[PDB]
């Protein structure tokens, strides 16, 4: 759940127009990541890993750290 | 009148919005560790629309109170009082009212343009993509659908406490400036009773779609 996180971090970056690194215990909320940014980052998860994600996903895993865990346990 | 949430809302429930982020304002104390961490965008976003909660309220007569969140986000009321707040790149919004007289209402405001590549097929059932493509032209019905799936969820979870995704709710856009969402899960609400119909209205002016669902007491 180490390697992908940080791909996860840089989805994240892309849907914001972001640069900078992302803490990855911080609330994607707190980043302005609002509920469209977070259906354009569910799409973007599942054509970049080729799996399958509840649309549902960020809001069920706020944060980097628990979002990487999600996607490594069923990918 | 001439404010957006006032066009979709009856004049019982109170509402305020702002197109800017005037200077000066600032959260209040209990609020401030919700933001403490946030970038500059979402403080001026949050702090703008709780100044417009907190106006819309004191029209109701309840003095300053910090507007918390709850376990899933919402909004935390104080008793007796149910409302939405809603916020995009050139809108803050509230609107309340009192549970003696209705009870739920969701806003959510959008800019009216075209959803992003691969939006509207996570969101909308294909027989919803069907019927939008059957409307007038001259709208973003796809960006009209998706707001109007977002205020059915707001107006559904201070009733259920329940998620309610994009594929659990169909919803209907008339031209009227109106639109129904027919939920297609079970609808036990937390009084007892079953939702499974809401009535909603729209306007777009401004360049921004705003969306409005009472659910009347
Ligand atoms: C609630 C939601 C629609 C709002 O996302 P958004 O992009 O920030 O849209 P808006 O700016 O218009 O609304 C933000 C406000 O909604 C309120 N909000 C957050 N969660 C809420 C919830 N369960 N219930 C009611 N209101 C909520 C908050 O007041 C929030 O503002 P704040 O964080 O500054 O306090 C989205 O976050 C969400 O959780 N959607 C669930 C899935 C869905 O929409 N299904 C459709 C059913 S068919
Ligand atoms: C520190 As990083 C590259 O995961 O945002
Ligand atoms: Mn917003
Ligand atoms: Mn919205
Ligand atoms: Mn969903």
């Given at each position: 759940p180490g390697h992908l996180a940080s791909a996860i971090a840089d989805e994240i970056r892309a849907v914001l127009r972001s640069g900078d690194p992302i803490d990855?215990?911080?609330?994607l909320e707190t980043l302005g990541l609002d509920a469209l940014m977070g259906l354009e980052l569910r799409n973007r998860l599942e054509a970049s890993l080729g799996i399958t994600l509840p649309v549902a996903l960020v809001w069920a895993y706020p944060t980097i750290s628990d979002l990487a865990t999600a996607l490594c346990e069923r990918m | 009148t001439d404010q957006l949430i006032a066009s979709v809302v009856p004049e019982l429930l109170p509402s305020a919005e702002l197109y800017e982020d005037p200077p000066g304002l600032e959260p209040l104390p209990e609020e401030e560790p919700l933001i403490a961490k946030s970038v500059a965008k979402r403080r001026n976003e949050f702090i703008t629309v709780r100044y417009c909660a907190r106006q819309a309220l004191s029209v109701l007569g309840i003095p300053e109170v910090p507007i918390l969140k709850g376990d899933k986000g919402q909004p935390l009321w104080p008793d007796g009082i149910v409302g939405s707040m809603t916020h995009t790149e050139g809108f803050r919004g509230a609107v309340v009212g009192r549970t003696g007289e209705v009870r739920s209402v969701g806003i959510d405001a959008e800019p009216h343009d075209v959803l992003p590549n691969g939006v509207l097929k996570s969101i909308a059932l294909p027989v919803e993509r069907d019927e939008l493509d059957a409307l007038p032209a001259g709208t973003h019905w796809d960006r009209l659908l998706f707001c109007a799936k977002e205020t059915t969820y707001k107006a559904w979870f201070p009733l259920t406490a329940r998620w309610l995704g994009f594929e659990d709710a169909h919803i209907t856009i008339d031209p009227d400036g109106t639109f129904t969402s027919r939920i297609?899960?079970?609808?036990?609400?937390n009084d007892g009773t079953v939702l499974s119909a809401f009535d909603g209205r729209w306007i777009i002016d401004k360049g921004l779609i705003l969306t409005a669902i009472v659910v009347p007491k």
């Open positions: 990855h215990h911080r609330p | 297609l899960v079970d609808g036990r609400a």
